[PDB]
Amino acid sequence: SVGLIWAQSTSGVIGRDGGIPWRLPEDLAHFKRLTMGHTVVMGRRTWDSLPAAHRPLPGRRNVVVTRQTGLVAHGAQVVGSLEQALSPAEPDAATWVIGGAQIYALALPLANRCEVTEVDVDLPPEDEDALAPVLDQTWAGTSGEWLVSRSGLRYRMHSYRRL
Ligand SMILES: NC(=O)c1ccc[n+]([C@@H]2O[C@H](COP(=O)([O-])OP(=O)(O)OC[C@H]3O[C@@H](n4cnc5c(N)ncnc54)[C@H](OP(=O)(O)O)[C@@H]3O)[C@@H](O)[C@H]2O)c1
Ligand SMILES: CCCCCc1nc(N)nc(N)c1OCCCOc1ccccc1CCC(=O)O
């Protein structure tokens, strides 16, 4: 099982200026609950984007997809392709692809699940933004209710499975 997991604004922005252009603690807790104890696969730019306290993501096997020989920042297992990231895999569990946009594009043809957090923040896309992948007719989804963050932002979760 290969799952994509991401958070996006309603406009579809996932990344800006090498980070995430909102703060939503409830999404971080959701992300930890779904990924804890599993392999997480990410692109190298996302790896370098992690604050030092969160790199590597604790309690998870951190796999970084890169064309380089290796990385200056410690804690990852490097691979040269998504296929190398995905095999071998954890039994009875999902391998989670955790971004960014380039790695989501590579993984989308292979995924069987997407777990999306939608954040109701008004962020008109800017020229260099990373955007969420668009799901085609092979996906069926369900959506949770709108929730209110302690910070006041509305947010909700959507879950998609491959038909
Ligand atoms: N909102 C969310 O849920 C979420 C989640 C994750 C990330 N983000 C944001 O997304 C942005 C980063 O996304 P991004 O698309 O710019 O970068 P990315 O997908 O994280 O990483 C891109 C890098 O992955 C490597 N790569 C890409 N395709 C490859 C291939 N076919 N084979 C081998 N290596 C390959 C390359 O590393 P090398 O250059 O080292 O070769 C490339 O520079 C940041 O703003 C981050 O904060 C948001
Ligand atoms: C602060 C928002 C964190 C979740 C964003 C997110 N939210 C969802 N729903 N899906 C994602 N793929 C994602 O991105 C993960 C990579 C970025 O992680 C980061 C970044 C910076 C600080 C901390 C972490 C994770 C720490 C941990 O899991 O212990």
Whether 51 is in the pocket of ligand 2, judged by its Cβ within 6 Å, is yes
Nearest 5°: the CA angle 106, 129, 30 is: 70
Output the known binding site for NADP(+): 7, 14, 19, 44-46, 66-68, 100-103
* Residue with tokens 């799901």, as numbered in its chain: 135
CA of residue 32 to ligand 1 center, whole Å: 20
Task: Map out the domains of the chain as residue ranges.
Answer: 1-163
CA of residue 102 to ligand 1 center, whole Å: 5
- Backbone angles phi and psi of 20, in degrees to 5: -110, 125
Specify the amino acid at residue 97. Answer: V
The strand pair at 39-43 and 13-15 is best described as unpaired
The length of the chain in residues reads 163
CA of residue 31 to ligand 2 center, whole Å: 6
3-class DSSP string for the chain:
CEEEEEEEECCCEEEECCECCCCCHHHHHHHHHHHCCCEEEEEHHHHHHCCHHHCCCCCCEEEEECCCCCCCCCCCEEECCHHHHHCCCCCCCCEEECCCHHHHHHHHHHCCEEEEEEECCCCCCCCCCEECCCCCCCEEEEECCCEECCCCCEEEEEEEEEC
Q: How far is it, in rounded angstroms, from Cα 130 to Cα 133?
A: 9
The candidate with the shortest Cα–Cα distance to 45, out of 12, 21, 71, is 71
Q: How far is it, in rounded angstroms, from Cα 13 to Cα 3?
A: 19
Cβ neighbors of 43 (< 8 A, separation 6 or more) are 64, 65, 66, 99, 100, 102, 103
- Taking the chain, what is the end-to-end CA distance rounded to the nearest angstrom? 14
Whether 138 is in the pocket of ligand 1, judged by its Cβ within 6 Å, is no
Specify the amino acid at residue 25. Answer: P
* Residue with tokens 């604004």, as numbered in its chain: 9
